[PDB]
Amino acid sequence: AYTNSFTRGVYYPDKVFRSSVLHS
Amino acid sequence: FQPTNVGYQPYRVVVLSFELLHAPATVCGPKKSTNLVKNKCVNFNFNG
């Protein structure tokens, strides 16, 4: 069987704090 | 490996890999820590 993931599965890519920023 | 073997001889090797990360340090050098100073211009060192 199947379902859609939607926007799940994003994770913090590194152990650095950042705020108010659009990182890539 | 006979003792009569020069590059034919056995060599022991150790490779040290450093888990260098922007994360909690836990193996560090013998360098001592100071007290902490705030609201003044200072030449700091945190975990290297």
Swiss-Prot record, chain A:
Top-level taxon of origin: Viruses
| Job description of the protein | Attaches the virion to the cell membrane by interacting with host receptor, initiating the infection. The major receptor is host ACE2. When S2/S2' has been cleaved, binding to the receptor triggers direct fusion at the cell membrane. When S2/S2' has not been cleaved, binding to the receptor results in internalization of the virus by endocytosis using host TFRC and GRM2 and leading to fusion of the virion membrane with the host endosomal membrane. Alternatively, may use NRP1/NRP2 and integrin as entry receptors.
How it assembles, according to the record, is: Binds to host ACE2. RBD also interacts with the N-linked glycan on 'Asn-90' of ACE2. Cleavage of S generates a polybasic C-terminal sequence on S1 that binds to host Neuropilin-1 (NRP1) and Neuropilin-2 (NRP2) receptors. Interacts with host integrin alpha-5/beta-1 (ITGA5:ITGB1) and with ACE2 in complex with integrin alpha-5/beta-1 (ITGA5:ITGB1). May interact via cytoplasmic c-terminus with M protein. May interact (via N-terminus) with host bilirubin and biliverdin, thereby preventing antibody binding to the SARS-CoV-2 spike NTD via an allosteric mechanism.
Which protein are we looking at?
Answer: Spike protein S1
Q: Which organism is it from?
A: Severe acute respiratory syndrome coronavirus 2 (2019-nCoV)
**Gene this protein is translated from:** S
